[PDB]
Design a protein around this ligand. Structure first.
Ligand SMILES: [Mg+2]
Ligand SMILES: [Mg+2]
Lengths: 304, 292
């Protein structure tokens, strides 16, 4: 089982590590044919990235001919590239996709999944929502339930920030602390302007409801310190059959989301049978990589 | 695929209704070979139960020769019978089991599952713990992680009664108020036994659980089930405001799975006929997909 690993920051390295910890027998035949980053292509499975050749992901894909692409690269919300056209071409080749990269599914879910459905190709995408906390994969074990509405906290960075702000730390200081900790990048736009949460609710509305939505259809706002006096604020993502949105709201103590704090995330799934809530870490590179690994083993069991 | 439905109270009625609701392409070829109750054997798929033959689940097993036994009969916590010997005969014939009956698994998990593993037979058992809220099946989507500890609220009723007590409506009134919407912590004890066998690998039976139910004058207390490699117990505990279980009130279950990677918690409605039947139905589809 040959993997092409696209991306190698912290999530990529954590993925490589988990895989080599032999946590499952389904993973005995798994090889890393290559790893591709901004700095080139490494045709070897080593802990540190040293490129062997110049080139992008398309060149790597053509040279390696993997069985699976593991996509842990950064979300590009402008157009989803190069991941979007990379997924389309791989699926046509009967190449499976495992992704934590939100952008292509947030932009072109129906385009991706129809084509995957037509070619019998499997897409792991647990890592796109709530990292290693089953969200996509939770729904997989709820077959035949019809989802009515979803509601949750879907962004680790802004939750950690709004948690600190509830404790008397300023927006600015909670920002710098999220960055020192790695949860937020030097440019935290996607988190703080709410793109990330909006991407996630888009994916969930697509997969769980069956709404044919893109991130364009989502009315969203991020965080900024013009927020309510004496409230615990949460960046709430919502979707049903009719609407999908993300906004920071005052949370009351009776809400099952009130105490979902720090990098913790939660999802409330209301179905025709029941209303369930799941909670766990929303960020952390080990967590995100574990989402991808969960998909990998599931793919190996033919359970995607 | 031919089912034998064992039990036809509310859960079994709810399962038969769900199955014909055309919920999945996986369920297009599924037929009910027969339904068994304590009054006998109906060899037909109908809404109303009327016996075609007298005789027990063993006679029905022989007469129908099904592919799958769906067990939604009531828990017999004395000895797990007839389900426990039924399951053994089933597995030995290559017949899969989907169950909501806690008792056989709570009393003799290792005996059932060693047999099934050696014979290659899949068991669906989601409905035994937290009904239709993925618990057993949550851990199925957590592959390659090691479960260090479990914690939770595994009985809706006791949880609901405890909710009113701390709120003001103390033990006497809360007892009576509960019955209007309708205690020793036994039911949580069976559920935690199953969770400990499957997720931790502790070869526990119900007799190993140190369990105590609610008292009259509790000095926010919750009925808490817990397991790890060392211990399995159910104690009423005053729970800290920092707990993610603190807000789990009413007729609700919740489960905190702690692995080497992460700590996750799932919460849903406790136990109900449609919920319970949905757990069995989920397992059925999962089994059809070969994902058990
Ligand atoms: Mg190589
Ligand atoms: Mg485009």
């Amino acid at each position: 089982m040959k993997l092409l690993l696209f991306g190698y920051g912290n999530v990529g390295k954590a993925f490589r590590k988990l895989l080599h910890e032999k946590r499952s027998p389904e993973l005995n035949d798994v090889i890393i044919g290559g790893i591709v980053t901004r700095r080139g292509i490494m045709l070897q499975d080593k802990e540190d990235f040293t490129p062997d050749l110049e080139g992008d992901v398309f060149k790597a894909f053509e040279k390696i001919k993997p069985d699976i692409i593991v996509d842990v690269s950064s979300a590009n919300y402008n157009n989803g590239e190069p991941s979007l056209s990379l997924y389309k071409e791989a699926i046509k080749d009967g190449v499976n996709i495992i992704t934590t990269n939100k952008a292509p599914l947030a932009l072109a879910f129906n385009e991706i999944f129809s084509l995957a459905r037509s070619k019998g190709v499997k897409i792991g995408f647990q890592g796109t929502v709530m990292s290693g906390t089953p969200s996509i994969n939770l729904y997989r074990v709820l077959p035949g339930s019809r989802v009515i509405k979803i509601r949750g906290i879907l962004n680790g960075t802004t939750n950690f920030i709004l948690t600190l702000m509830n404790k008397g730390v300023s927006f600015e200081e909670a920002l710098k602390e999220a960055q020192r900790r790695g949860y937020a990048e030097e440019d935290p736009t996607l988190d703080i302007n709410g793109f990330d949460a909006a991407a996630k609710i888009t994916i969930l509305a697509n997969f769980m409801i069956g709404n044919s939505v893109t991130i364009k259809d989502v009315k969203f706002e991020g965080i900024n310190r013009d927020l309510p006096k004496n409230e615990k604020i949460k960046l709430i993502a919502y979707a049903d059959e009719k609407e999908v949105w993300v906004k920071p709201l005052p949370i009351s103590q009776d809400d099952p989301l009130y105490n979902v704090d720090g990098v913790e995330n939660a999802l409330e799934i209301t179905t025709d049978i029941q209303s369930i809530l799941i909670r766990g870490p929303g960020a952390g590179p080990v967590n995100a990589a574990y989402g991808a690994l969960s998909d990998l083993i599931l793919l190996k069991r033919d359970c995607l």
